[PDB]
Subunit: 293 residues, 4 copies
């Protein structure tokens, strides 16, 4: 398998005003991430891709386009999970047929699934697809917390590579590295990249890398090299940008910052707010002038 | 329009071992609720229907079968909500064409939608379908809390009838009746039916009414009649049953109790546990003998 | 032992601007509750008494004054709990010597005590004082949740009489009445008095009964009588008042409403806001005119 | 003022079986921290000192003994906060008279204090004592969350030096350093020392430094020097020890580990479990052999 370490943008998708995928803009976002953000890979179909608001056919179309555009130039991870295991299997087979390097799956949500249910969900997608699997943990959205011993159970399936860790529990993080030193962790919070990197995460997956992937890689590499003073300066500027993005509307503002570099990054999909008001456009432009010029 | 007050079973769905819908079993469930449980209506496609684990086609087939079977004998509400607004619109159109008496929609979940996004979601479904709408509030699963003022904003759409209140905040409940006296509330927690009835809810939507509809009606009517001593005895026996069902696995145990009365209620849908372990099958038989014999 | 059923005001305390106790005002509060509010008893030293902001000497002086004033006319319960078990013991001894009819104690808070630590705390107070004990449950402030089985363990001490249930879990409440039919429950949320009464609570302990004791008795007795239409009207007016008091500052506004009836209810104790801002003084006068005139 | 940067043990207190302070053992704990753990300073009266279970007289006695034993050899910070502002002022004057280098105060808890109330509490202790003030933030115990802008308001009082940050929000941490670069942060979670240090905290306050202060200082210094690989090894061993301590009972196990080096660290104070069972003694000894031999 391709090396799955380093910087992965969580791929945003270009939507038309009616909510349909804009293929031309999606291809532009892919190309911008490869050529300009110089990412190691793309995480496709995650929360950033507005995935959970889309139909099965739409998720396939995104997987097909992203893989057609990226070809073999970078690593590609397909997030196929949802509350629907039969959909996760179907998407998982599809992305596997398309040559995606690993699958990833959000812990099933909404219903209060027991841990054995959650494990069986992972084991079923793996068995049905035969592909690698990255557990996607995002407690602040799912309300699901997985402990060290529970991760170990998940890791008994030798196709589980590790965890996309969109959590802030740095004690849990350190304990997962100690217990399962050969399993990978990708840090999911961009605004906490430096401290996650200081504990030896193997890479990161983030929304803001679609526009700030140059700083993200510096923070990651500089931390790993022990150049903490410099990584901290770059985290500080990054977090001024991120604080601004979050204040303005995270997905719409990253898209606006893409548009300001000529990427037809499109609308967001309803029920998210579909377009930035003119005041927030002006705000995004200030962020561009201050941080990305 | 049909009277939507009174006792609504939240319809359970009969699944095959492979997760496909068993139509024969699903019709037996609908018939049993109408003929034996004597419900006023069915709430179709909600959390009890295992709706969120299903594909769009499957949710349509369920709406079709339930309406095929029940025809015009009882009231029918279609829960069409989800994270996917375009799916909610499609399902609302379909259910509206089938002649469902109102739609209902879960507050959109997973992402942290703002209240104006949540309102637009309701107003969009309504506008696209032309049908009545019941707001579906289940904070314990969605993490969405709507205040009295926010319900007022929702209720400015005159096709919003009120709320399926799967919530235990009885201060909120009394305040909604005070502020919006002409808007309906259906209580969603069967184990707190009596106190909710004491505050003048217009009916109730419940998973356990599929097997305990006789008692539930009694609690409701005895409470509305001011016969609280008797209502309370029956709530106590009902809650001995409910406590048993919760410890044994909520939806599986309701299904097993149906099966024990000859209703082919089938399996649950993965990634919920698909069948009861053997000792839990036996526990279910003991609840049948103690409470539903 | 005195009958401890019925309506208990949670006693407010009159403070001077410097935070010292105003005895004259505190006696006026006790008299007003007995003579005008017609309470069955007072719950002295609980959260409404601003007890947790006070020194040991101050908590004794309050117990002394309240018992001095009320003598034997009404029932008297002393809340002596805290994080400090040795203080709870000292206060329980003192209150027991004064002739308080039962002690009560808050679950110990701040630290995350285990259930066996929590049980030992109750059993220690009981053993040292020889007096009856009411468990004081207020999860919204302490973060401590006690299950039915845990209450059973507490109730194995035969001097535990039941629970001051400042909690909204009406499933839990019905289950406690089912499992421990001879143990008492006092409802703690005044704004949900009616549904709690519908489940057979033995009385209620309330901050707002210091000014709204006439209505509260009515809701309680009308509900116990099965006259729910009338109980509900009075709960609605009571909750218009309570909503006003909460928005305006709970304890200050109850004190201002006392003051407006000539009861010198004094200041609140820092670090609570010591006095109402001027516009809030005026808001309190408008609640008086609307609801307590 | 003495330099307040670096490693501060949160001082444990030796109690007798009856709950009284054992002065001889308290002096031994102080001396062990100065001479053997080589701490920069002691944080006296915090959660680790079992402070919130003690009387005012007892808190004074601890302050008096700790200061008499330490003299001027290290920095000393006195945690004087509680729900009782008048007690916090009294303790604050006392510790100030004794020559404590700064005061610190927990955000007032139990009651849901507003932010202006919290700020006035800090401003009152400062004004009454004239001493420096370190805000003590421990959300997981108090339930109080203070945002960046709210910290800025607190910092408008030029005697506030910064924050003892017993929180895990490393985004908040990074933002406080960016907004208030001259204000100090002490990290409060020992098991997350390395990532807190990687963001430039100025020191740490922790329970486990009373026994692991040699490793703690290596992790802190090595991180600051950019020797991340080595600091991570030492954090890994430290966290094996800490995981064990927490599993066994945190305060009793640190005390047991002190006893195994000849410190008469005493009992814990009720309502905490007062003594370790013989199995947990044996467990502590294994921790000693594995990590502290
Ligand atoms: O909640 C989110 C927003 O998508 N998490 C993302 C994080 O980058 C935040 O956006 C960022 O740190 C600001 O909070 C990230 O983990 C991307 C992702 O997980 C996905 O596409 O599934
Ligand atoms: O979460 C649930 C279980 O589906 N809520 C249901 C409730 O009956 C509980 O099962 C019951 O009180 C046991 O706790 C109910 O409100 C039905 C419903 O909401 C739906 O199907 O959408
Ligand atoms: O938290 C409170 C306010 O002290 N609880 C009180 C309640 O009356 C509320 O104030 C009321 O329902 C408004 O929400 C009450 O249970 C009295 C009490 O517990 C005590 O003093 O210990
Ligand atoms: O909750 C605690 C336990 O006292 N926090 C302490 C932390 O060291 C933990 O004990 C440690 O990281 C393990 O969780 C620490 O911040 C000491 C302290 O704050 C105080 O004395 O007030």
């Amino acid at each position: 398998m391709k090396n799955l370490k380093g910087i992965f943008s969580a791929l945003l998708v270009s939507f038309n005003a009616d909510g349909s995928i804009n293929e031309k803009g999606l291809r532009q976002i892919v190309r911008y991430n490869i050529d300009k953000m110089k990412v190691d890979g793309l995480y496709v179909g995650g929360s950033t891709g507005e995935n959970f608001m889309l139909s099965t056919e739409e998720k396939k179309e995104i997987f097909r386009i992203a893989k057609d555009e990226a070809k073999d130039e970078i690593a590609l991870i397909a997030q196929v999970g949802s509350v629907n295991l039969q959909e996760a299997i179907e998407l998982g087979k599809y992305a596997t047929e398309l040559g995606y390097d690993s699958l990833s799956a959000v812990t099933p949500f909404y219903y209060k699934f027991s841990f054995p249910e959650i494990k069986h969900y992972y084991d079923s997608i793996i068995e049905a697809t035969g592909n690698y699997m990255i557990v996607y943990s995002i407690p602040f959205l799912t309300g699901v917390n997985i402990g060290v011993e529970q991760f170990g159970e998940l890791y008994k399936n030798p196709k589980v590579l590790g965890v996309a860790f969109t959590a802030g529990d740095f004690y849990l993080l350190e304990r997962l590295k100690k217990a399962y030193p050969n399993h990978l962790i990708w840090a999911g919070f961009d605004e906490m990249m430096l401290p996650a990197a200081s504990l030896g995460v193997d890479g990161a997956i983030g929304s803001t890398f679609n526009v700030n992937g140059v700083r993200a890689r510096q923070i990651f590499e500089l931390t790993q090299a022990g150049k903490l003073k410099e990584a901290l300066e770059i985290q500080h500027v990054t977090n001024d940008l991120i604080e601004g993005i979050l204040a303005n509307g995270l997905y719409l503002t990253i898209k606006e910052l893409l548009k300001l570099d000529g990427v037809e990054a499109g609308y967001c999909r309803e029920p998210m707010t579909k377009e930035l008001s003119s005041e927030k456009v002006a705000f995004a432009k200030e962020l561009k002038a201050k941080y990305l010029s």
